[PDB]
PDB file of C-alpha atoms in Angstrom:
ATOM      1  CA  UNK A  21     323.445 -66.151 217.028  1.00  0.00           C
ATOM      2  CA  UNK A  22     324.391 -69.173 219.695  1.00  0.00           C
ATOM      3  CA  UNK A  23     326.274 -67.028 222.884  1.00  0.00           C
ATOM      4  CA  UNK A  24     328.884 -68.620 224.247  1.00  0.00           C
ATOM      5  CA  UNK A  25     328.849 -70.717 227.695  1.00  0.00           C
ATOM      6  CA  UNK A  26     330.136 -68.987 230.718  1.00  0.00           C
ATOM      7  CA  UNK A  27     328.726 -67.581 234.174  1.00  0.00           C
ATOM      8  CA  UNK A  28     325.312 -66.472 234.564  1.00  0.00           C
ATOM      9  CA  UNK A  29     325.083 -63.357 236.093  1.00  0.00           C
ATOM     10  CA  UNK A  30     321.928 -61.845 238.091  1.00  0.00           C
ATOM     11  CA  UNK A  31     322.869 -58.081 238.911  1.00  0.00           C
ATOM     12  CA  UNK A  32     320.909 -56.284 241.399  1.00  0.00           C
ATOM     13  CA  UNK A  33     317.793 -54.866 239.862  1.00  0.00           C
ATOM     14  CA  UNK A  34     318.481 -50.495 239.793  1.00  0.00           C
ATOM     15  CA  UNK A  35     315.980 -47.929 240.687  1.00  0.00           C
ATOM     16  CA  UNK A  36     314.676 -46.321 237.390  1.00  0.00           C
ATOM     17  CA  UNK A  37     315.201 -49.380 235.113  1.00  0.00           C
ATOM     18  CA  UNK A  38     313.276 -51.610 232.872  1.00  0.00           C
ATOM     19  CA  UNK A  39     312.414 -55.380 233.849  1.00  0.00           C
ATOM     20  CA  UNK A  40     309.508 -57.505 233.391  1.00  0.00           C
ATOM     21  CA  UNK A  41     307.369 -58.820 236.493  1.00  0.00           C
ATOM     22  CA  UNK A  42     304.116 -60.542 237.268  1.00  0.00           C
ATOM     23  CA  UNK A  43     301.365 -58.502 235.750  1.00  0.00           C
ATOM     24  CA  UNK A  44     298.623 -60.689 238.392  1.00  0.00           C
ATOM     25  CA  UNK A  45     298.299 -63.806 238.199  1.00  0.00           C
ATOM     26  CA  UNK A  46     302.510 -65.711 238.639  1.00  0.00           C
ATOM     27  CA  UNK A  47     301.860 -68.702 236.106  1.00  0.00           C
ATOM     28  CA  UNK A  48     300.430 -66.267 233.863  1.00  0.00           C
ATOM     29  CA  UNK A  49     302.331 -63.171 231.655  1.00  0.00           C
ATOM     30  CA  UNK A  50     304.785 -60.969 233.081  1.00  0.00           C
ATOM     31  CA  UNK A  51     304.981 -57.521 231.398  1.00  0.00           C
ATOM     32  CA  UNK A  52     307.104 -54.263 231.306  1.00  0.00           C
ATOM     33  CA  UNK A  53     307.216 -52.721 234.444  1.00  0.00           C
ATOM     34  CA  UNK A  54     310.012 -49.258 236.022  1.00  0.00           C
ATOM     35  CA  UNK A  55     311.595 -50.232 239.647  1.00  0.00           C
ATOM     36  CA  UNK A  56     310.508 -46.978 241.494  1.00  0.00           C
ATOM     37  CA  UNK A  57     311.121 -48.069 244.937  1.00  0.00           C
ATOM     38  CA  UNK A  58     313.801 -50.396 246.849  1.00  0.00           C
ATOM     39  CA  UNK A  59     312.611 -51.987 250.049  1.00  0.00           C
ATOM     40  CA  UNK A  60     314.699 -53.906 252.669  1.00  0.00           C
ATOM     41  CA  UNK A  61     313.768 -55.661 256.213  1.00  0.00           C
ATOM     42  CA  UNK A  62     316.157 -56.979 258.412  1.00  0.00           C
ATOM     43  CA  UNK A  63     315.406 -58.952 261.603  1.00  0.00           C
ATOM     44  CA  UNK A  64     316.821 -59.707 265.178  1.00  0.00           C
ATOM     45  CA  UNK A  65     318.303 -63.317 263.452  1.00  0.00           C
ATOM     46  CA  UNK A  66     320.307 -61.218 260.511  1.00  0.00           C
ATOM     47  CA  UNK A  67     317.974 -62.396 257.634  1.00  0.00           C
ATOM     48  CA  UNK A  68     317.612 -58.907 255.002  1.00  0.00           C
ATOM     49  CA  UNK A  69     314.485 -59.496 253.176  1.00  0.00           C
ATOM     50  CA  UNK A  70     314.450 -57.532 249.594  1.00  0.00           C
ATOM     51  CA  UNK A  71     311.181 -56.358 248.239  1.00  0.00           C
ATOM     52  CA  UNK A  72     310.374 -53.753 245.386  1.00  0.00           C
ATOM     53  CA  UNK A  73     307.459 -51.043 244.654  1.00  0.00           C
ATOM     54  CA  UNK A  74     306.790 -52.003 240.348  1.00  0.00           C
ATOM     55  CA  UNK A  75     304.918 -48.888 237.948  1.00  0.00           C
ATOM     56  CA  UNK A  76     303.677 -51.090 235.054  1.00  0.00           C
ATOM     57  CA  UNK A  77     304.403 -49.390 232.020  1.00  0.00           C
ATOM     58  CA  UNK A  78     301.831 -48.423 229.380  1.00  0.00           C
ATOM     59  CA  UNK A  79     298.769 -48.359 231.460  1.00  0.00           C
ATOM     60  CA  UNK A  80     295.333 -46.705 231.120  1.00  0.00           C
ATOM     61  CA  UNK A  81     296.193 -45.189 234.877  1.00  0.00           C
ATOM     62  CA  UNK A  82     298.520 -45.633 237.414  1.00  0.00           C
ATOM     63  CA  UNK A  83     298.976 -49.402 238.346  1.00  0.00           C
ATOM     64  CA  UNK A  84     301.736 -50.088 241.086  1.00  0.00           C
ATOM     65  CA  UNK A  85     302.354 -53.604 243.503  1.00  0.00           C
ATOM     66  CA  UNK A  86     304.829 -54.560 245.291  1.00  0.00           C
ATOM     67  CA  UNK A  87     306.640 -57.602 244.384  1.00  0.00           C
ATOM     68  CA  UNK A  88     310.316 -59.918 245.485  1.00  0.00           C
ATOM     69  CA  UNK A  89     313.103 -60.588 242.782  1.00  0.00           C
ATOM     70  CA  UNK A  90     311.374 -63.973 242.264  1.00  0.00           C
ATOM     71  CA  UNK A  91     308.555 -62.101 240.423  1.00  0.00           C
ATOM     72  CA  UNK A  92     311.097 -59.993 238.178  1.00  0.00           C
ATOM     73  CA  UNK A  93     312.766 -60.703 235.074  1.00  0.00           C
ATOM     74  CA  UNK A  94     315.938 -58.921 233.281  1.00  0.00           C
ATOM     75  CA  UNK A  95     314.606 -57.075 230.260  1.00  0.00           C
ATOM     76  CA  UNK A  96     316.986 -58.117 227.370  1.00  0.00           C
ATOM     77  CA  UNK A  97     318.584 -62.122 226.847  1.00  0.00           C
ATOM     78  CA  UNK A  98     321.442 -63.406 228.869  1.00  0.00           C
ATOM     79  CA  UNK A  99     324.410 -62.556 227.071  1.00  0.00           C
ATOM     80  CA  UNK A 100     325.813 -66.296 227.892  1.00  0.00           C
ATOM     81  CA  UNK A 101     323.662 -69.642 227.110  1.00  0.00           C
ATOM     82  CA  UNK A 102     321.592 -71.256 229.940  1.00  0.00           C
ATOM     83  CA  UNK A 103     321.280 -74.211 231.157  1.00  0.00           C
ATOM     84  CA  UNK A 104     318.899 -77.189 232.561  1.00  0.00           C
ATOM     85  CA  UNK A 105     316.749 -76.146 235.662  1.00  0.00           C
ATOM     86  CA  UNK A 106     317.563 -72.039 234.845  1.00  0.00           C
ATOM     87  CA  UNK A 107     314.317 -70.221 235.953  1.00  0.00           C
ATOM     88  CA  UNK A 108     313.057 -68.192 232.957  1.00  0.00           C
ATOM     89  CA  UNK A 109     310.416 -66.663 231.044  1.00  0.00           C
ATOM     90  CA  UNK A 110     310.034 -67.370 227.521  1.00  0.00           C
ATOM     91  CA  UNK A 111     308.085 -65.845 224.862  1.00  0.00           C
ATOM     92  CA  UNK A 112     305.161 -67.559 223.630  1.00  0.00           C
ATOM     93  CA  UNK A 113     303.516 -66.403 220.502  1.00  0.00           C
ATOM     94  CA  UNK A 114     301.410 -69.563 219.263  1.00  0.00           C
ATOM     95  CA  UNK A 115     301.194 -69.118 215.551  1.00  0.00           C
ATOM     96  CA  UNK A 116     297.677 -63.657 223.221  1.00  0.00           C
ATOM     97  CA  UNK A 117     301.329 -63.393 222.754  1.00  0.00           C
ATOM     98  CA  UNK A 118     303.284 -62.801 225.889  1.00  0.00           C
ATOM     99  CA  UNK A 119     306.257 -63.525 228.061  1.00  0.00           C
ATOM    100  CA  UNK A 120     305.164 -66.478 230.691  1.00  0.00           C
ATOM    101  CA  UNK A 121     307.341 -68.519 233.747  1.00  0.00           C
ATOM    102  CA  UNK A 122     309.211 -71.541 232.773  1.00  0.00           C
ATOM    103  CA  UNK A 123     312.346 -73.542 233.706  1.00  0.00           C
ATOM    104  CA  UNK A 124     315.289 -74.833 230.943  1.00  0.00           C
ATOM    105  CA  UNK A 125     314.522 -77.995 230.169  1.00  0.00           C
ATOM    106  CA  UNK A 126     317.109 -78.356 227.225  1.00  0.00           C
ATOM    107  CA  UNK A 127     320.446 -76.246 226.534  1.00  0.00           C
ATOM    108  CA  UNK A 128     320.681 -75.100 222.807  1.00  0.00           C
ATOM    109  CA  UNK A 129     322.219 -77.572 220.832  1.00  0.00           C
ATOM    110  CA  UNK A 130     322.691 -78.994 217.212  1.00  0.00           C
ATOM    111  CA  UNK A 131     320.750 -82.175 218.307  1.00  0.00           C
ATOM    112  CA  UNK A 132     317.426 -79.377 218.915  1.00  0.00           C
ATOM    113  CA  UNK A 133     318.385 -76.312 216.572  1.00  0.00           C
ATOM    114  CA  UNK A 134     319.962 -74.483 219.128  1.00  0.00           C
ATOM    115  CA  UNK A 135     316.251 -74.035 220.951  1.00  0.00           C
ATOM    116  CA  UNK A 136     315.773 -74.359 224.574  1.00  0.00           C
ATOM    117  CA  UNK A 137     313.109 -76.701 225.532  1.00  0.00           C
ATOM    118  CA  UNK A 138     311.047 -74.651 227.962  1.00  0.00           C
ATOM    119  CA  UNK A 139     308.778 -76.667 230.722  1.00  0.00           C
ATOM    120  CA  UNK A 140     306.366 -73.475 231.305  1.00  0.00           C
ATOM    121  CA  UNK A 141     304.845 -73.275 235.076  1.00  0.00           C
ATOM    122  CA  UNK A 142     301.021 -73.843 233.451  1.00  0.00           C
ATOM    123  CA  UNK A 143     302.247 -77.307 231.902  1.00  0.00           C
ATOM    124  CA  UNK A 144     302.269 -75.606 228.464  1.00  0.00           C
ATOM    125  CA  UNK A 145     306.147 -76.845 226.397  1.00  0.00           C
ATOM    126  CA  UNK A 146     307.637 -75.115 223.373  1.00  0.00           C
ATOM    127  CA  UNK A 147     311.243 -74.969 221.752  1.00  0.00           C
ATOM    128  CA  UNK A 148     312.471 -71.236 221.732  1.00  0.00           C
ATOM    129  CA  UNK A 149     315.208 -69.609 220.500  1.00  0.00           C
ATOM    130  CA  UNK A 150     317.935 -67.591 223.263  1.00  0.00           C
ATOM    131  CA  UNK A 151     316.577 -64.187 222.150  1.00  0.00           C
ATOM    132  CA  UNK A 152     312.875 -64.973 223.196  1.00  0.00           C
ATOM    133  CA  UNK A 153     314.267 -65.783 226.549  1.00  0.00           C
ATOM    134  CA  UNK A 154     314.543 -63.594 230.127  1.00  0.00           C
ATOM    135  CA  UNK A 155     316.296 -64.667 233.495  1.00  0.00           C
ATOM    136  CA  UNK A 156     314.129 -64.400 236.350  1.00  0.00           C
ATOM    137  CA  UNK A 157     316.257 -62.103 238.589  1.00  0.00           C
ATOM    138  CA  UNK A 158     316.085 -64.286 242.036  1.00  0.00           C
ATOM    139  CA  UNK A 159     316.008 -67.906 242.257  1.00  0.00           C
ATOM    140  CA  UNK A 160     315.898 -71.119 245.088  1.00  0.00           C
ATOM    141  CA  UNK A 161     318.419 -73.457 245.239  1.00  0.00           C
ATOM    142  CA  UNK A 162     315.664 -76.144 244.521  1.00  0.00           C
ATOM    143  CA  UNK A 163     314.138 -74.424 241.950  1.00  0.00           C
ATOM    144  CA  UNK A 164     311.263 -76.137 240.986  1.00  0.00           C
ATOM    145  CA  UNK A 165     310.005 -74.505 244.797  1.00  0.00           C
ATOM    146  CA  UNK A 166     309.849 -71.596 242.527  1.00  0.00           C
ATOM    147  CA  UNK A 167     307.193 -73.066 239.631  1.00  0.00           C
ATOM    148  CA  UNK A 168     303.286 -72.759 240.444  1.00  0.00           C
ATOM    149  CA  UNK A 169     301.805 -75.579 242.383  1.00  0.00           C
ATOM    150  CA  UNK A 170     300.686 -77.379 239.553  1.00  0.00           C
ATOM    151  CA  UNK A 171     303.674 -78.484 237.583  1.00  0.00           C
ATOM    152  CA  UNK A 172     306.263 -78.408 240.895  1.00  0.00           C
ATOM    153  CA  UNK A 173     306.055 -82.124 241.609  1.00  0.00           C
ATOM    154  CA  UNK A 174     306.930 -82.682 237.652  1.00  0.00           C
ATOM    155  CA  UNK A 175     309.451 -80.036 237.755  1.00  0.00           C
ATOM    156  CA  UNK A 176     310.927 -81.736 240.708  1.00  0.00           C
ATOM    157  CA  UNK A 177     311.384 -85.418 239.790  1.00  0.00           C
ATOM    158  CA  UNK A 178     312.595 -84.007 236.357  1.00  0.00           C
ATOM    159  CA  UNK A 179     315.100 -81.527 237.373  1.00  0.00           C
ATOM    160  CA  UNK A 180     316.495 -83.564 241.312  1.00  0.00           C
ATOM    161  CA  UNK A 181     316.201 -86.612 240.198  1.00  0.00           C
ATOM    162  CA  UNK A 182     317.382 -85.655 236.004  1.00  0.00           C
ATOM    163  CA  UNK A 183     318.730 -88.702 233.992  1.00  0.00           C
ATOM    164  CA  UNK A 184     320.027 -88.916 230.318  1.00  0.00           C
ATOM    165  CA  UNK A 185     318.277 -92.245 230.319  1.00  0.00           C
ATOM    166  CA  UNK A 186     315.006 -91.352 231.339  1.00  0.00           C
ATOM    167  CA  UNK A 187     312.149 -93.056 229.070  1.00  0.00           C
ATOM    168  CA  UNK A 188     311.297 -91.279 226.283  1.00  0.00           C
ATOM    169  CA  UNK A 189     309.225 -92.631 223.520  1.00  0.00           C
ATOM    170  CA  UNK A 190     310.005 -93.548 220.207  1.00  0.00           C
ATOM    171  CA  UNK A 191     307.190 -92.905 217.650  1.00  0.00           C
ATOM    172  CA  UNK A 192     306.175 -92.696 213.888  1.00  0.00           C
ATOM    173  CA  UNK A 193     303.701 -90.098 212.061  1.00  0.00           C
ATOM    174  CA  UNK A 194     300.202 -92.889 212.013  1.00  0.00           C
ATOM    175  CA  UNK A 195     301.293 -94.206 216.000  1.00  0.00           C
ATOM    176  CA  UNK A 196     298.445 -93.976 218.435  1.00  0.00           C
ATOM    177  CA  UNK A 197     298.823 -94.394 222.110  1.00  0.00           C
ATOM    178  CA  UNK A 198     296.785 -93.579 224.882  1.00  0.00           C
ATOM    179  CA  UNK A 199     296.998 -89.562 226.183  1.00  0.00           C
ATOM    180  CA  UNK A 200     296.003 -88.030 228.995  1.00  0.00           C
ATOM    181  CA  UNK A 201     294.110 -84.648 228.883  1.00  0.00           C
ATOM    182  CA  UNK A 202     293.063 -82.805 231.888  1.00  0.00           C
ATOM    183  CA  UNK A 203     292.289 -85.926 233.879  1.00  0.00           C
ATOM    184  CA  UNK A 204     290.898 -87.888 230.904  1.00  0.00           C
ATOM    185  CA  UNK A 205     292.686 -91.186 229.311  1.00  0.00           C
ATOM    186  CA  UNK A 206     291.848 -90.545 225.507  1.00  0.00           C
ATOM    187  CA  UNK A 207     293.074 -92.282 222.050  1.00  0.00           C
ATOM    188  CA  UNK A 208     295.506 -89.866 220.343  1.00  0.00           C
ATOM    189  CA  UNK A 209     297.398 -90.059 216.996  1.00  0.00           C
ATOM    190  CA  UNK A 210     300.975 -88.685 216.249  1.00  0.00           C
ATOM    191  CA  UNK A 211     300.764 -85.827 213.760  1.00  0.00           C
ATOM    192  CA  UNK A 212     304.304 -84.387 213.790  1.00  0.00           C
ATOM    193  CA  UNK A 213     307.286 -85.129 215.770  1.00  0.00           C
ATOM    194  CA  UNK A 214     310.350 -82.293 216.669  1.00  0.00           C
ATOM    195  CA  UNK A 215     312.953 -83.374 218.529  1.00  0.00           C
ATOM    196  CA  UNK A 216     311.654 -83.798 222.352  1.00  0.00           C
ATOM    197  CA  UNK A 217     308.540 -82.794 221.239  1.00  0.00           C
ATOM    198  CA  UNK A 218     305.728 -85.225 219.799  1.00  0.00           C
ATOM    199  CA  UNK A 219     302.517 -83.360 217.785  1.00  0.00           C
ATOM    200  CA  UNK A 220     299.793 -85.852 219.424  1.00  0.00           C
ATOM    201  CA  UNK A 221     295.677 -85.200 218.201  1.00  0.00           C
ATOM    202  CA  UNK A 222     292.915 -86.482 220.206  1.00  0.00           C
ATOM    203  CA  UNK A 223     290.472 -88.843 218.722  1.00  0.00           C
ATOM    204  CA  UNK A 224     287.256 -86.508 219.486  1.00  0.00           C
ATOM    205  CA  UNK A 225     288.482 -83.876 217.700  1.00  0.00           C
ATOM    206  CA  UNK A 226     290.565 -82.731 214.990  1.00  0.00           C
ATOM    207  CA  UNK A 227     290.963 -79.241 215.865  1.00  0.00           C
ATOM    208  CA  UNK A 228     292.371 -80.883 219.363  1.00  0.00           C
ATOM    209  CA  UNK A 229     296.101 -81.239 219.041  1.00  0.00           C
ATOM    210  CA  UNK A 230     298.786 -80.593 221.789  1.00  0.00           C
ATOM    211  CA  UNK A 231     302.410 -80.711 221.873  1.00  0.00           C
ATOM    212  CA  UNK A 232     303.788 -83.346 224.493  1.00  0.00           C
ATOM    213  CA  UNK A 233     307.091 -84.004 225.748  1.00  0.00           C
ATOM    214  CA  UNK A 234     308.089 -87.568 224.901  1.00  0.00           C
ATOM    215  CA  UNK A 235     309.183 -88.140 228.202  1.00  0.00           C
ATOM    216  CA  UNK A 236     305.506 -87.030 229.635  1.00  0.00           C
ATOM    217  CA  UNK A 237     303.501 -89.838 231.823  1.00  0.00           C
ATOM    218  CA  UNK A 238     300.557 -88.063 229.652  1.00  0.00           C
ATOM    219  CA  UNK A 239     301.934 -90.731 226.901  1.00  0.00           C
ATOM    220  CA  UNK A 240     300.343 -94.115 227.744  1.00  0.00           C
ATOM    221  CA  UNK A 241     303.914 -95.698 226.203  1.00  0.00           C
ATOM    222  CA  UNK A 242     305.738 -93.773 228.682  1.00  0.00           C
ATOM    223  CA  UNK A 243     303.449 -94.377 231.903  1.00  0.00           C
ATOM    224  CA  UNK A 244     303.661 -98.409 230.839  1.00  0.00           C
ATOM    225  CA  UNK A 245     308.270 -98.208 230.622  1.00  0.00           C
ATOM    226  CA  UNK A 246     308.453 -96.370 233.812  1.00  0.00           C
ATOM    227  CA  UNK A 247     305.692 -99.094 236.207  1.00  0.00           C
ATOM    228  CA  UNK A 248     308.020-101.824 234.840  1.00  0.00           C
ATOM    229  CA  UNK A 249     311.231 -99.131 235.608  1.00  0.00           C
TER     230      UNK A 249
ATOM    231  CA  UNK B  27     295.289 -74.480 226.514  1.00  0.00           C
ATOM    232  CA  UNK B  28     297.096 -77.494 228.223  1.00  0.00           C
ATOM    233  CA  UNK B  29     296.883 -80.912 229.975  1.00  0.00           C
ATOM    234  CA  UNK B  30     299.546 -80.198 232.037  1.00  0.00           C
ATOM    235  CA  UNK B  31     303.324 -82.559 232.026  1.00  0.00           C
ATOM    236  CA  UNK B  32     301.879 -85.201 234.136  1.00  0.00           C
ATOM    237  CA  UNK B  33     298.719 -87.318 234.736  1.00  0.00           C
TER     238      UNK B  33
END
């Protein structure tokens, strides 16, 4: 179902339990993985510095790293709902399936289905439903500090500087505007539209379709509202 | 693939 509001808890991760954590790569998929080993450092200053030893589970051979709470993630949902700027990782299956890093961009609501909006650390956004999410067990007060280079300065003015009123474009199905794809200013035409979301396909090819958030400066429309603020 | 949240 929806859970109910209330306090989100992040216990301390237990020796011998299951959590999911960084497989190599930190914008990329985070797997199941047993906490065999607890490691703490304290300094002269006071400062005590948590670290863990990770087995990865269902491996060809033994695969171990060592890894800090900010590269761990609970292994069921959070029995409350979460909330905008939570640090996450939500499952992304794509009609490779896998868990990957994201912040709440959305809280689940009639107005979206009850489906977060997830902002995922490679740029990547999807709606997904409370049960397909996982808290990351450790996060920074500013947490877009948290989210791979590449997305943090996004993450950033979306999250510290968040407004209601932020522009957001209003389309049709048969609207084309101009979209930005890796670097390049190309004609696109909307396809579908859900909620936050807008279904936009590149003129070059058919086959080339991408979800974009309506508030994205990858919309032309959007780029145009906020030079003029 | 993705084109990111920005330009």
């Amino acid at each position: 179902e929806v859970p109910p509001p209330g306090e989100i808890v992040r216990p301390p991760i237990q020796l011998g339990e299951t959590y999911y954590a960084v497989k190599n790569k930190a914008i990329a998929s985070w797997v199941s993985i047993k906490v065999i080993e607890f490691t703490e450092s304290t300094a002269i200053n006071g400062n005590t510095m948590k670290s863990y030893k990770i087995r990865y589970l269902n491996t060809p051979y033994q695969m171990i790293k060592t890894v800090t709470a900010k590269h761990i993630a609970y292994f069921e949902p959070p029995p409350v709902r979460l909330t905008i700027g939570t640090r996450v990782i939500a499952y992304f299956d794509g009609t490779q399936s896998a868990f990957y890093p994201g912040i709440i961009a959305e809280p689940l609501k009639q107005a979206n289905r009850y489906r977060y909006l997830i902002f995922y650390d490679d740029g990547y956004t999807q709606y997904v439903p409370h049960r397909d999410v996982r808290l990351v067990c450790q996060a920074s007060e500013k947490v877009w500090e948290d989210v791979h280079a590449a997305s943090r300065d996004f993450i950033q003015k979306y999250v510290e500087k968040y407004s209601v009123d932020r522009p957001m474009v209003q389309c049709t199905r048969g609207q084309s505007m101009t979209t930005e794809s890796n670097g390049t200013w190309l004609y696109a035409r909307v396809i579908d539209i859900d909620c936050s979301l807008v279904l936009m396909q590149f003129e070059g090819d058919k086959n080339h379709t991408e979800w974009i958030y309506r508030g994205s400066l990858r919309l032309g429309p959007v780029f145009r509202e906020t030079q003029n603020n | 693939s993705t084109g990111g949240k920005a330009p």
